[PDB]
Design a protein around this ligand. Structure first.
Ligand SMILES: O=c1[nH]c(=O)c2nn[nH]c2[nH]1
Ligand SMILES: O=c1[nH]c(=O)c2nn[nH]c2[nH]1
Ligand SMILES: O=c1[nH]c(=O)c2nn[nH]c2[nH]1
Ligand SMILES: O=c1[nH]c(=O)c2nn[nH]c2[nH]1
Ligand code: NA
Ligand code: NA
Ligand code: NA
Ligand code: NA
Ligand SMILES: [Xe]
Ligand SMILES: [Xe]
Ligand SMILES: [Xe]
Ligand SMILES: [Xe]
Lengths: 295, 295, 295, 295
């Protein structure tokens, strides 16, 4: 037997950082969960009980806090690239670092119509994420994403003209509820190293904001022919607005809301045009994915 | 042996309702999870296998959908009272109904600075809840609550002057992070029946909004001496603003964020005035409760 | 306004303890999650910012570890009573302690048909719990429970003869699946203090084992007329076997498994006597409760 | 823009099946959660709103129930292969099916030392899983796994001799607690189609049982030099016992239990040889992975 692949590190490292402006008194907080996994010439820790090649996962944890102390933690694409680069530069025998960051929302409170200097609210479990792979001699690959963005529209969604055979019971519809949890990932062109990542810093927050805005607007305005058709429109627009993105991937559950026939009860009408009360279904759910790239 | 207490019913009934304004084209959605438990002269179903006294839980489920079809579902205090009253009026041998409703957020989307007519976002897992107990001959008791409101302030929280003995290691502090998930419940004076509940309908949404606003403002503005002292200030203000509330209860976790001493690493300073990077603690947590009533 | 009720303390304190037998080499592990909430003359911490009355929740955490170091942690009824008694004896102004303990399963592994001396498996998320209320001058009240015991029987459950009216669609049945998650609580007679709790130590583990055995056997053997009738049989037997229990409470979800009509597809028969494939329903669920005491 | 990859289908389809032996009266139950995603010539549903190419996800759901009705559901490797093959044979334009199955435990109850004919218990949230990829013209690729197997040993784990630098605070140890949740996957050699999968049916359950047994025994008996070294020993043995497996992958969290220094309290000794009470840490955790194949 032989080791074909190996990676190890620290998962679920929660980190908070505060920035304090001395001039204005305004404070800004960041909270993330970080995972770092390393690869390199570490096979002997598995095969020969040779721990000399192991950077202890506890040390990886320490390094995350130290790096957060000495560097900006925003945008997360930059922080992840700094953190990953550290490991390949510091340890001769480590040749790849894989950094995943989940950013949690702390939105500044408005009190009496004014932004509060040091108080924050968690408005939604929506996350902004990055995956950064730093591979020695191959640069820095960054995938940015948003997840946990949950939306619903109550009309202007249709689904008809699908394949009908002996397995089909679904009725065609010209008016249905459409609800999903959006997971959208945009993959950046490969960067040569940290200097190049630094050179593009302003694009990271702007592209996240664009991806979010395009997602929300397209969802709200499309008279949707299917989840497939609407998601494609989203991806197309993101690629058109940021040339440094190579691909956009969406993964969307179709969270079903079923009509409830109440006609058995005093002829009550609650289907088709008369549908007012619906039963949200926890499971099963449709799952629709697509990756869109350039011609 | 004897049956000392018994209740039964249907839990986790998910319900969605849409309202469509024909004039303006605007749609509004409501989504709730409902639980209904009944009590009454049902002991024989337990002791003698006499199912004749059982309103099937499946029928309770049907009744929830039918009631939602025929009545407004907002404010939830009214819907819960209608639903509970139904059971005690319809079934001679049922003498109490206990209705719990959790309302999920579907907030209308703003697209290009304008409210969208039929598209919604789940902004946070904050819930608005009601517990309604309808007891034959004793009226209607309603407890209203908000839960899952998660906040953090990065300064203007202190904790010093507590009891110190041989079990104490905690250092006094004049500047700490304070973060909590707010669970706040206000208990209404007993109502004589549905007519009286209807007469107070406008107060329900207004009091919820007040409770939320007081919670947020007090949290943001109090230079907090402890969770205990700040929560009391919140409860006092709510009672002062709505005379029909008898008690206010708060239950607040104290979600700790620990300083990280980094001085072992090149004398890096990250404690006290120099603290920038902290470690959020998932557990354990303080838990502080109080019920405030009138003199 | 006035403080009507107040309690505070530490929740979610995870504790592990190991016992090492020097003679046999055998090790035994215990793992629990503990919550302690205190009451007493603490109103001024809320109303006047007087922290002098506060035993810090951090100190409560320390006390839990110290008490676990110096005392047996099994049975949990004894440990909870020791822990609660500590607070009312140590602090003059604290008059009640409320201790909740959840015990996690670590079952010794069998390797090659022999018990291993120091290796354990988590066989199920079933928990054994205690709630201990120690109130100065009123003794010690203990509620013991098991929870998270999930069972299913594929036949020998019936449900017919229930009330039928205009809200009823449920068909009577003489053969259905019955599945539930068992939550069973037995409440001990009040104990005068720690000496009396110590005197009954052997009864705690034995009664837990009896409650579990009666639950499982009755579920498996009863040709069940309803959840109500079967649960009553369980409670009756527990009360008959332990005279020091005053009441038994069961709370049981009815986790539904629905027949799937496949007759639309090539006349395939999958209902009634021909039912083989079913759809488990995540929600809604029946919820049936009962508290049984002595005549 | 162009569609680079696309797949869609139904997730979270819960299925239960019962087998009834008419001769013995014994019943056996199976419960699974199934996901099926399809690929093929479906780009136009995304780009042109052409639903004619879409097998509706609702129809995929129906197909899962129909297939479960007409075929054995055990071993899951066989059921997944039947289900996946169906889609590529039935629909000309579908060229790959991806089937994931999670099998839930329903273990027959022992009542009075005898196996009960129709009553079952969920002993642990451990799962047995399969991933089956059926690709037209490329055969059937099957990955089998176990997950959610949670174990702990209280001694006979060491960790010393790791890299020490200016980022390191971790002390070397010759005696620690080791606890993990095991995720183990074995990848079968590619099968040419369903006939070949059928020919190997007996190997599936036997290999699962072997993988489980090797995991448990090695964990219990290894005087572990690290998670890395112990997991390698596990993987090596599995590959030696089943020649039709190409690779074994383990992914193991290192769930930390920290010593608690109590010496500040009356010189109480609870570290090193005197350690009895520990604090389980919910996060962060080490994460160690390895894929082992043949020379
Ligand atoms: O078994 C271990 N492997 C590791 O890589 C490690 N790092 N810290 N502690 C550890 N324990
Ligand atoms: O056992 C049951 N008890 C009930 O009260 C009930 N209601 N519907 N189905 C049921 N099954
Ligand atoms: O606000 C607080 N209240 C308390 O009771 C406490 N105990 N430790 N820290 C604390 N902070
Ligand atoms: O938008 C949809 N896409 C689909 O593929 C599908 N299948 N059933 N319903 C559906 N809705
Ligand atoms: Na390197
Ligand atoms: Na009545
Ligand atoms: Na006292
Ligand atoms: Na095909
Ligand atoms: Xe951070
Ligand atoms: Xe609703
Ligand atoms: Xe413990
Ligand atoms: Xe199944």
């Amino acid at each position: 037997s032989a080791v074909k692949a190996a990676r190890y590190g620290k998962d679920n490292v929660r980190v908070y950082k505060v920035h304090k402006d001395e001039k204005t008194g305004v404070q800004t907080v960041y909270e993330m969960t970080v995972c770092v996994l390393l690869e390199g010439e570490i096979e002997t820790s598995y095969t020969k009980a040779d721990n000399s090649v192991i950077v202890a996962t506890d040390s990886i944890k320490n390094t995350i806090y130290i790096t957060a102390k000495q560097n900006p933690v925003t945008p997360p694409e930059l922080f992840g690239s700094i953190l990953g680069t550290h490991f390949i530069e510091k340890y001769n025998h480590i040749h790849a670092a894989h950094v995943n960051i989940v950013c949690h929302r702390w939105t500044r409170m408005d009190i009496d119509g004014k932004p509060h200097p040091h108080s924050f609210i968690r408005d939604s479990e929506e996350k902004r994420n990055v995956q950064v792979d730093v591979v020695e001699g191959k640069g820095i690959d960054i995938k940015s994403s948003l997840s946990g963005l949950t939306v619903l529209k109550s009309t202007n969604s249709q689904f008809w003209g699908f394949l009908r055979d002996e397995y089909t019971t679904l009725k065609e519809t010209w008016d249905r509820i459409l609800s999903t949890d959006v997971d959208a990932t945009w993959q950046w062109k490969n960067f040569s190293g940290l200097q190049e990542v630094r050179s593009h810093v302003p694009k990271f927050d702007a592209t996240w904001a664009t991806a979010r805005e395009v997602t929300l607007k397209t969802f709200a305005e499309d008279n949707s022919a299917s989840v497939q058709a609407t998601m494609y429109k989203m991806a197309e627009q993101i690629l058109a607005r940021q040339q440094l993105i190579e691909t956009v991937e969406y993964s969307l559950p179709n969270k079903h809301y079923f009509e409830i026939d109440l006609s058995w009860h005093k002829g009550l009408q609650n289907t088709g045009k008369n549908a007012e009360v619906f039963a949200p279904q926890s499971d099963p759910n449709g799952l629709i994915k697509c990756t869109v790239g350039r011609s």
